[model samples]
Structures are given as C-alpha cells and as structure tokens.
Target: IPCPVDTSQVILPPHLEKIRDRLAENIHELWGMNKIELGWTFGKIRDDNKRQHPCLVEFSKLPETEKNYNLQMSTETLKTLLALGCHIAHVNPAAEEDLKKVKLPKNYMMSNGYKPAPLDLSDVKLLPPQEILVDKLAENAHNVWAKDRIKQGWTYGIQQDLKNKRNPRLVPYALLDERTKKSNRDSLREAVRTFVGYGYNIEPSD
Candidate 1:
C-alpha cells in the first residue's frame, strides 16, 4: 500500500540472526494455530478428509522441510520490515533524476500484438546502486499504458477480459503487491540498460 521497498535487496544484518530464527519458529507456530482453528489437529499421518495433520507440534519439532519453509518466510518478513524502517543505499549513483522522469518514448509503438521486445537480459544485471533508479519504473510504464488504453475506453476487471476492453493491471501502483512489482522491475531492465549505455558513469556525486 506504500511505495515499494526493494525487498530482494534487503540484507538482514548479522545482529538480527537470533531474532530471525525465533521469528521463524513463531511463524511455524502460527501455521499450526490456524490449522487447529479449522478443525485440523495432530495425527501420525496427514489426512485431508479427517482434518488431521502431523504439523501441530512445536516449531523445533517440525521437519527440516517445514522449518526451512517458515524460516524463509520469517527472513523475508523481517527484511520487509527492516527495509521499511529506514533504508537507502548509496549514491546519486544512477542518474539520481526525478522519479517522475521515467517515461515512454514518444514513438513507442504497440506491436501488432501489443507485446514487447524479446530482450530479456535478466542475466545482464544492473549494479545494485543503479538498480535503485528502477524502483518506480513499473508504475510509470503502467500509467502510460493505462492512459493509452482508456483513451480507447478500456476499463478494469478481475482479468484482462479484453472482450469488453477491461483489464486488471490498470490498477494503481499503491495497490500492487511486491510480486507484481518484481515483474515491473523486470521489464524496466532495458530502461536501466539505457542509462548505462548512455555512459552515466553513475557514482556517489556528493
């Protein structure tokens, strides 16, 4: 609901290791609590029809698979919070221009199918600081697309639902999930590439 934080880039500090593991264990407990509320409880074997599960045990008792799963979740959750609390990496590094400046090229044409170029280039990663400039990219591109579509009378729907000229991705950036934003940054890779290709020589200016 807020401006996006680059969660994948969040590196949980070494000092948080204890909290991280404890949070993971608590995460495991929360899953068990929710299951019990749904009439599921401990049994030797998991049974969907009988509402029985073996996962009701303590987090320390959980199988490595389950513990690892929750560990992942907990780590991500903390990073999200840490990212939100106060975070910024160095440099005017990557153009450091106004976020509002990212825009569609004037002659940018929708191909016959409205799909984009074949340039994935994910393997061509942006340096971490330069990647900072990419955060707002998806929202900018989406606004341009939505404006172009609405001029032709497109509306919103659960699905793209093009038969009625409705779409789901037309929503505001504030409402989009981190997962959705990830794909946005993915497409913006070319934009970042352009910055480098222009020879920005991005670095800490002051």
Candidate 2:
C-alpha cells in the first residue's frame, strides 16, 4: 500500500462546515445518477436524534457559484477517498447472493494448525559446565555506584533543578541485573548516607 497522507493536523469540523452544503449536494447528485445508494433518501427523514429533517437541493439545482464550489470540493473529496482505499472493487452484483451461501470443507479450520516441537538438548555437552564470568565494567568508584543505583531501580542522569547536582534517576527494578550489576554492598556506608542526606527526589528514568 502507498503511504497515506498525514491528516492528523487537519482541523475537521470547521473545515467540514465550509463544504457542508456542497457535500450534501454531491451526495444527492450521485444518488440521482445511480452512482451511489443511500439507506435513506434525503426527503424528511428522522435523524439519529429523532428530529424531523428538511431536504437539500440537487447539485445542478444549486446556484452557479455554489455548484462550482461543490464541483471542486467533490473532486478533491473523491480524490482523497480513492487514496484512502475507497475505490471500486471488481465484483458482479448478480453473483453476490450465491457467494453468500458458499460452504467450507470439513476440518478446514484445522488445516493450518500444524506446529513442530522444540529440538532435544539433553545429549549436548560443554567443555566446562560452570559459566565463566567476564568483568565488562570499569573497576572504579563512580561506575560501582552507577551499577548499584541501577540494581536498586535507579539510573544516573542530569537533574532538572539547576540548584542540585546530577543524580541517579529512578527506574523499574527489573531493568537492572548481574551481567551489568555489581557494587561493594556499601563498603562505604558512611559515604552513601552522606549523599542521601541531601534534600532532593530522584527523577524518573523511564
């Protein structure tokens, strides 16, 4: 499919009013030409609000200026409709009734249900069964704190408040782990408490 035009910024109701009369006229003219079918005709029909409605004139019956306005409006409207996949489909109306009564074969629903099982790994062997841990993080005080903060659902980032220094931001606990997680477990408990004593809340990281 082609990329659709982004109409998110297009203001609707106000623009709709500009083409309201033209839209009604276009609908009526298309109906008159057998180009379209409506569930109800325009003459004195009960609306959704159950109010009595009046009729609108045909496109040709409109004033010259109004007719021209609808011509331009209807053309652009149809162009947009076609771009949005509202164009005609190839189908014979006479065959529609028979097609509705078509039947499916027995077990048709189960024809595509086949799924394979997972491969066996019980026979597989390894050189060393124990996992070899590799240290990927820098062995430094600052990095140790970053990992510790991450383990406790906190991430480091700049503070929004200009008065405060950059601090660890809070995050979901599940986002941290051992592969990238480690700390001295407060080998410096006094130093950790000194930083926490500052009056500032951690910002959300996610």
Candidate 3:
C-alpha cells in the first residue's frame, strides 16, 4: 500500500495510560495474530506485524510507550485500511491437518459436503509461556468484567445484593476464591477450543 498509519509520534495521553496499556497489550496480540495469518513468521526482529517484530519480548516488558505506540499505530492502520475500502473480518482458514482431528465447522460443513475437525479440546499440556498468557488473560478477563460491574454501580460486598448492585466476587482476579478462579481459568480452555476449532494455532514462535 502507498501509505499506512501516518502518525508516528501520536502518544496516548496520561489519563489514557491505563486504558492504553490494556489496549496495547490486546493490540499486539491482535496485530501479531493477524500478521501470522498473513504468512508472517516470528523471531524477534523489527519485521513489522508479519514477524510481530523480531526477537519479540513477552507482553510484560516493552518499555512504557512502546505498547501505546503499537495501539496508536493500529488505530491509523485500521483507519487507513477502512478508508481504502477494506473490510476487516475474522477469517479462520483451518489447517486441514490440524482440524482433521478436531470437530467444528467440519460438521456444519458436512451438511454442505465439507468435512470437519477439531483440536485437542479434550486436554493437552500447556507450555510455560502459554500458562503465563492464560493466567494473564484470565486476570484481564476478571478486571474487565469487574470494571464493567463497577460502572454499573456495583460494589464489593460479602454477598450478592442485586438491589444495591454489590457482590462478593467483585474483587480482583488474584483475590477471587479457588472455584471462581478455576472458573476463570476454565474459560481459557474454552477459548483454546474456540481458537483450535477455527484453526487459529496459538503455538509459540519457538
């Protein structure tokens, strides 16, 4: 394309830092996944989204403004694409080999004469890095949910109070009880299933 994301120094404001940080983390994952889908390999070099920047570091560290820059870049990137008459849509071109063993669109496709498959949705060993990602994602899920609840006039309480909009599990993911925490974690399993069902592999670059 002739141009993509014109702004180079459009930094996020102070107040938006917290929000921006969260967005940045999300942006990177979205950006990275999209890049990978477009035939971009990973290895951690400044190779744009295709390679998700060469020698990519974990989301935990990337300098302060770096993530914001990514989020900012994605805005213009998306805007430019949209202005260029492009439609961003989710696409899942499942790898036949991987999907062959999994069940999903395949069964639906079967009705249309197309086969289907699935991933190890039953159970699989999650690597260490993925464990971190899952934990982070689970926590993020909690925070986002809690934030929404707070916006709805909800408050922390020892028990549910629909009238006052309060609940006991309104605390941070870290402070949640075991079952609830497990519940949050289990949600990730479904996520894994969904991704695999769609053929979106979440394997590490290594």
- In model 2, where do residues sit more than 4 Å from their true spots? 1-58, 85-87, 93-206
The candidate that achieves the highest lDDT relative to the unseen native structure = 1
lDDT for each residue of candidate 1 in 1-206, tens digit (9 for 90 to 100): 22344567778888556645754554444345446557665676789998877666756666789778777755654465455453323333443232222222333222221111222223344787656645544565556557767788888878646668887766887577789888677545444453333233333223
Candidate 1: regions farther than 4 A off: 1-4, 87-206
Candidate 1, residue 202: how far the Cα is off, in Å: 33
Report the poorest 10 consecutive residues by lDDT, candidate 3.
107-116
Residues 52-127 of candidate 2 have per-residue lDDT tens digits of: 2222343444457656755544444323333333322223333223222113234221122211111122232222
By lDDT, highest first, what's the ranking? 1, 3, 2
TM-score of each: 0.39, 0.20, 0.41
Q: What clash count goes with each model?
A: 0, 0, 11
Whole-model lDDT, model 3: 0.48
lDDT of each: 0.53, 0.31, 0.48
Output the lDDT of residue 3, model 3.
Answer: 19
lDDT of 3 by residue, 1-206 (tens): 01122334543335334433443444454343444445555444465544434413434555457755665543443333333333332345543244334343322231123222223345444556555555655665576567667778888887665667868777766677888878676555444444434444454332
Q: What is the lDDT of residue 48 in candidate 2?
A: 37
